[PDB]
Paper text:
Transmission of the New World hemorrhagic fever arenaviruses Junín virus (JUNV) and Machupo virus (MACV) to humans is facilitated, in part, by the interaction between the arenavirus GP1 glycoprotein and the human transferrin receptor 1 (hTfR1). Each non-covalently associated protomer of the trimeric GP consists of a myristoylated stable signal peptide (SSP), a GP1 receptor-binding glycoprotein, and a membrane-anchored GP2 fusion glycoprotein. The GP1-TfR1 interaction involves the insertion of a tyrosine residue (Tyr211 in hTfR1) into the central pocket on the GP1 surface. Crystallographic investigation of the Fab fragments of NAb MAC1 and a representative JUNV-specific NAb, JUN1, in complex with their cognate GP1 antigens reveals that both NAbs target the TfR1 binding site.
To characterize the mode of MAC1 recognition, we crystallized MACV GP1 in complex with the Fab fragment of NAb MAC1 using a similar strategy as that described for the JUNV GP1-Fab JUN1 complex. Fab MAC1 interacts with the cognate GP1 molecule at the structurally observed hTfR1 binding site in an interaction that occludes ∼1,230 Å2 of solvent-accessible surface area. Five of the six Fab MAC1 CDRs are involved in MACV GP1 recognition, where the heavy chain contributes to the bulk of the interaction. Indeed, the central TfR1 binding pocket remains unoccupied, and in contrast to the long CDR loops that dominate JUNV GP1-NAb contacts, the 13-amino-acid MAC1 CDR H3 sits shallowly and approximately equidistant between loops 3 and 7 of MACV GP1. The CDR H3 of Fab MAC1 presents a tyrosine (Tyr97CDR H3 [Chothia numbering scheme {35}]), which points toward the RBS pocket. However, unlike Tyr211hTfR1, which engages Ser113MACV GP1 within the RBS pocket, Tyr97CDR H3 from Fab MAC1 interacts with Val117MACV GP1, Arg165MACV GP1, and Phe226MACV GP1 at the rim of the pocket. The absence of a receptor-mimicking, tyrosine-mediated mode of MACV GP1 engagement by the anti-MACV NAbs MAC1 and CR1-07 may be, in part, due to the presence of a disulfide-linked insert (loop 10) unique to MACV GP1, which structurally hinders the accessibility of MAC1 and CR1-07 to the Tyr211hTfR1 pocket at the RBS. The Fab MAC1 epitope is further stabilized through hydrogen bonding of paratope residues Thr99CDR H3 and Arg100CDR H3 with Val117MACV GP1, Lys169MACV GP1, and Glu171MACV GP1. In contrast to the glycan-independent mode of interaction observed in the JUNV GP1-Fab JUN1 complex, the terminal mannose residues of the glycan chain extending from Asn178MACV GP1 contribute a footprint of ∼120 Å2 through interaction with residues at the C-terminal segment of the Fab MAC1 CDR L2, including Leu54MAC1, Arg55MAC1, Ser56MAC1, Gly57MAC1, Val58MAC1, Pro59MAC1, and Ser60MAC1.
Author numbering:
A (entry chain B): -1 to 213
B (entry chain A): 0 to 52, 52A, 53 to 82, 82A, 82B, 82C, 83 to 100, 100A, ...
C (entry chain C): 87 to 238
């Protein structure tokens, strides 16, 4: 017969510290309780948590437990902790080829937090290279949804903006974002004010940080 | 002592070429356990490639990776190898070695740290490290944020630290962005206003593929 | 043809049966689990534990000679012969509940087969009789002729 397909129908979930969560896993064929759970930390390190549906590996907190039979399985985490931020993978060990579910990402819900916004002009070093990057850091906010708009001399600018978002901070459950507006040195010297505006649910007004090249 | 699986470093390989990565095992009888291999791409879950039993050299492959992957092992050095043939962009991924328990239970009880393969025709380039300091007219708070812009390198990875690692708590290093065959990333650090600029703050960037190690001191703008 | 036995030391025994030799060890170490390995419910199931058919009747006789009751006693555990690691047939003789009477009966079987038999089973702890066929990886180096010559 065909390969055993492992389905984790929930790709991501979020819960508060102390909450109980359950992560479902189902197989396309009876796997007879040969079902293993792995935890992958954000840094990529993988650890076996549970084998044979419910058998906890040494050192794994008892908050982690596994249930299931036949095709349907579940990983339950009670009293969710800060250290449980991770992606959880199921895996059948019934027959070759071994196959894994696609993973369920776990993130912590916390209270709302406004971003701390900082703006940085290009260094003289970069200007010598012929580039000019204006960097806006938007740090330690929650929830993750945020909007950044750049304006040069009052006009919205979308070309040349690259954005990058960190994973959820393991210590305070916040997110951070970097937004970089890169111009050529010459274009940069053709304008005056470079402004980062952040819209976030914590405030009805944008958080506005600005640098003027006339310094 | 304890079980460890130490994998070889990141590889950049041109399309069409081959590459062989390794997994050095310690802390257990290497000939008495299967070594399995797993491929991870973002949003592609985990894919089992195959396994070798170094005790007798026997191998089992996922049919999806037959011909693509060739597993070997050397008992005398306790090292498992995975060789790729005719590499293409779909082979760009992180690859893990992972051992099975004694008795072949089809769970992977210890994992390597992963090896990142990049298949690309783009050539290796060292980064430029640019200091991010507040504008001269910027105001002073109780905290001050500084940064480093690590621009125009290839391939991944770089490593970014602050004051030779002394400064670690208030750091955010952002995922690199690829554009026109070059990566750029930024990193921020937040320190008390008393400490900087009175005490020097320096970001340390390393790019092994280009043999680049740069320290960039963040000086106030005047 | 007929089996011959010997006692190397306080935990190492051997049986020769036909052209095969078996390492028999009594210790508190087990690498088998009912979750993963083969439960031997009837003597025909010993075929799942051993590749060679000739080696099967000796183990069948040995188990009978130990006093194992195939109808009423708990099943033995063995590693599936299809696995790489080699034969491993295991009697659970722990001086604990659910195996206290069984364990004493099997130990008395060992005393009847080896006069010098030593009991290493501590009360309230696990204890096992383990059989590996000489030449399987599971017998390691303990069936080299430097060991077998000391027994006979
Ligand atoms: C050959 O025959 C042999 C003889 O028959 C046979 O050995 C016997 O096997 C039986 C059956 O397996 C054993 O009976 C069971 O024993 C289990 C193990 O007991 C010991 O471990 C427990 C768990 O220990 C972890 O958790 C503690 C609490 O957090 C920690 O303090 C520990 O440090 C340890 O943590 C470590 O491991 C964790 C898990 O990986 C991990 O999270 C953590 O980080 C860390 O790494 C102990 O609690 C237990 O303590 C007993 O003894 C002390 C005194 O020393 C007392 O104070 C305790 O009160 C307790 O009595 C042991 O140290 C037990 O888990 C099991 O109990 C469960 O099942 C029974 C029903 O059978 C229930 O009544 C009971 O309530 C338990 O239920 C739990 O599990 C079930 C699933 O089974 C679950 O549904 C339920 O919700 C609940 O979670 C039972 O007693 C027997 O002990 C063995 N005897 C001997 C002598 O070894 C052997 O297997 C045979 N060989 C083969 C190959 O088959
Ligand atoms: C019996 O001999 C073997 C082989 O050297 C050894 O491994 C084992 O520990 C010995 N047992 C005892 C009780 O001396
Ligand atoms: C039986 O033979 C196979 C090879 O055909 C081998 O892999 C396996 O370990 C052997 N099992 C035993 C119990 O000898
Ligand atoms: C032993 O393993 C084979 C697969 O190699 C399987 O077909 C068979 O059912 C197993 N036997 C037992 C008794 O588990």
């Amino acid at each position: 017969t065909g390969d055993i397909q492992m389905t984790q129908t929930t790709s991501s979930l979020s819960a508060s510290l102390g909450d109980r969560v359950s992560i479902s896993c189902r197989a396309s064929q009876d796997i007879n309780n040969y079902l293993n759970w792995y935890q992958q930390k954000p840094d990529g390190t993988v650890k076996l948590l549970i084998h044979y549906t419910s058998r906890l590996r040494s050192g794994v907190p008892s908050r982690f437990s596994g249930s299931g039979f036949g095709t349907d399985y579940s990983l339950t985490i009670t009293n969710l902790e800060q250290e449980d931020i991770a992606t959880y993978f199921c895996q059948q060990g019934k027959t070759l080829p071994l196959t894994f579910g696609a993973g369920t990402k776990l993130e912590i819900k916390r209270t709302d937090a406004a971003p701390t916004v900082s703006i940085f002009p290009p260094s003289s070093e970069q200007l010598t290279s012929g580039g000019a990057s204006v960097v806006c850091f938007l740090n330690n906010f929650y929830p993750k949804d945020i909007n950044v708009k750049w304006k040069i001399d009052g006009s919205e600018r979308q070309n040349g903006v690259l954005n990058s978002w960190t994973d959820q901070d393991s210590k305070d459950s916040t997110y951070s974002m970097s937004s970089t507006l890169t111009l050529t040195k010459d274009e940069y010297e053709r304008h005056n004010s470079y402004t980062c505006e952040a819209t976030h649910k914590t405030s009805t007004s944008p958080i506005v940080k600005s640098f003027n090249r006339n310094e | 002592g304890q079980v460890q699986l130490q994998q070889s470093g990141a590889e950049l390989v041109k399309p069409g070429a081959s590459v062989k990565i390794s997994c050095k095992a310690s802390g257990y009888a290497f000939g008495s356990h299967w070594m399995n291999w797993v491929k991870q791409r973002p949003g592609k879950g985990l894919e089992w490639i195959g396994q070798i039993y170094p005790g007798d050299g026997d191998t089992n492959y996922n049919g999806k990776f037959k011909g693509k992957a060739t597993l070997t092992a050397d008992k005398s050095s306790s090292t498992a190898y995975m060789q790729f043939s005719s590499l293409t962009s779909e082979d760009s991924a992180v690859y893990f070695c992972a051992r099975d328990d004694y008795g072949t239970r089809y769970y992977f009880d210890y994992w390597g740290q992963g090896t990142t393969l990049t298949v690309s025709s783009a050539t290796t380039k060292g980064p430029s490290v640019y200091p991010l300091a507040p504008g001269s007219a910027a105001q002073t708070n109780s905290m001050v944020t500084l940064g480093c812009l690590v621009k125009g390198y290839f391939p991944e990875p770089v490593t970014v630290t602050w004051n030779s690692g002394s400064l670690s708590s208030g750091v955010h290093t952002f995922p690199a962005v690829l554009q026109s065959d070059l990566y750029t990333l930024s990193s921020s650090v937040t320190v008390p206003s008393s400490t900087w600029p009175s005490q020097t703050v320096t970001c340390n960037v390393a790019h092994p593929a280009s043999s680049t190690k740069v320290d960039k001191k963040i000086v106030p703008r005047d | 043809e007929l089996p011959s036995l010997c006692m190397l030391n306080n935990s190492f025994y051997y049986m020769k049966g036909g052209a095969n030799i078996f390492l028999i060890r009594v210790s508190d170490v087990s690498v088998l689990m009912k979750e993963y390995d083969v439960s031997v419910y009837e003597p025909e199931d010993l075929g799942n534990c051993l590749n060679k058919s000739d080696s099967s009747w000796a183990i069948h006789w040995f188990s009978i000679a130990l006093g194992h009751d195939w109808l009423m006693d708990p099943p033995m555990l063995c590693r599936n012969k299809t696995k790489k690691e080699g034969s491993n047939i295991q009697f659970n003789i722990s001086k604990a509940d659910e195996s206290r009477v069984y364990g004493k009966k099997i130990r008395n079987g060992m005393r009847h087969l080896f006069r010098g038999f030593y009991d290493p089973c501590e009360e309230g702890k696990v204890c096992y009789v383990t059989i590996n066929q000489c030449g399987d990886p599971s017998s390691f180096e303990y069936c080299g002729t430097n060991y077998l010559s000391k027994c006979q």
